[PDB]
Amino acid sequence: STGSATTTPIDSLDDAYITPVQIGTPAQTLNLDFDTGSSDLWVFSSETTASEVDGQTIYTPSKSTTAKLLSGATWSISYGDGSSSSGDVYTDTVSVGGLTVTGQAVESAKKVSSSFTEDSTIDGLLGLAFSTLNTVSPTQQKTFFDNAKASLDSPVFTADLGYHAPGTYNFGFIDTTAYTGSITYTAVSTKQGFWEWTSTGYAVGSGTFKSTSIDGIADTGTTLLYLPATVVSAYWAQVSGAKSSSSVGGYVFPCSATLPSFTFGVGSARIVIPGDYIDFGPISTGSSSCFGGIQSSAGIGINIFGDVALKAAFVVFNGATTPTLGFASK
């Protein structure tokens, strides 16, 4: 089997991407944030504290003839941006882009933190990291990809995120018309539960390429590109007026600037992030100070190849017995 679904930016800045998911019988369609950095499939629901719901579409398990309470199971998760959610668990039928899993753990939120309530366009998350990170207790549950894997034509999924435009998540096949050149594959460590790999270096604009190992994660659930302070300083030094602002919480730059590109290495291959991808607009409405899309990972404890990086590529998440990651230009 295979699946194919369009993923759409939630706003004009590509702050996140949502993908329609069918849950239950008859289908309840919710728009979920596909997240290769976490491993829980959770949804706003009829159980969510009423005051914490503001415009999201909810899953109501009592209206699904295939829903079953997973007795005694609870979940609770925190994300790197300070947000969190928790609740109980059902199993139900879940379909993405025509690919169906029966008995998928659907984690129903009883509580969500303020930034979820405030994000009316996101109805929940669909985790695509390794199932070892799944938070369900006392019986850990499998991701949608893990449950689907055996049935897929090939044990892979691909992320093709658009810049200011829709893109595609495919399951079970590689669309050879969706990228240019060849796909370069690179080793993955699953020791931390992530799609963790090592970039071979970087360049800033038309500058020379610096060969240096940068360990990090391919994370569709993180908006920006978080790299070591040395790398980030080298980038922003090429933008007149750019500075790290403690009060804002990162590098800002004059909105009048034209940003240089940023290149990262995948083995001997190179992925170029155009400068425009790195502009996240005014820090507040009407400001001429703009927020940068490349930020320091110091204090995160890991480097994160988030959407800013991944949307410059066609990315293969290869879930064979020994997982690997593939990157192509597009």
UniProtKB/Swiss-Prot annotation:
The active site is at 35, 199. Disulfide bonds join 255-290. This is Endothiapepsin. It catalyses: Hydrolysis of proteins with specificity similar to that of pepsin A, prefers hydrophobic residues at P1 and P1', but does not cleave 14-Ala-|-Leu-15 in the B chain of insulin or Z-Glu-Tyr. Clots milk. The chain holds residues 90 to 419 of 419 of the full protein. Belongs to the peptidase A1 family. It comes from the Eukaryota. Its EC number is 3.4.23.22. The keyword Zinc does not apply. Coiled coil: none annotated. One of its GO terms (molecular function) is aspartic-type endopeptidase activity. Keywords: Aspartyl protease, Disulfide bond, Hydrolase, Protease, Signal, Zymogen. Residues 17-328 form the Peptidase A1 domain. GO terms for biological process: proteolysis.
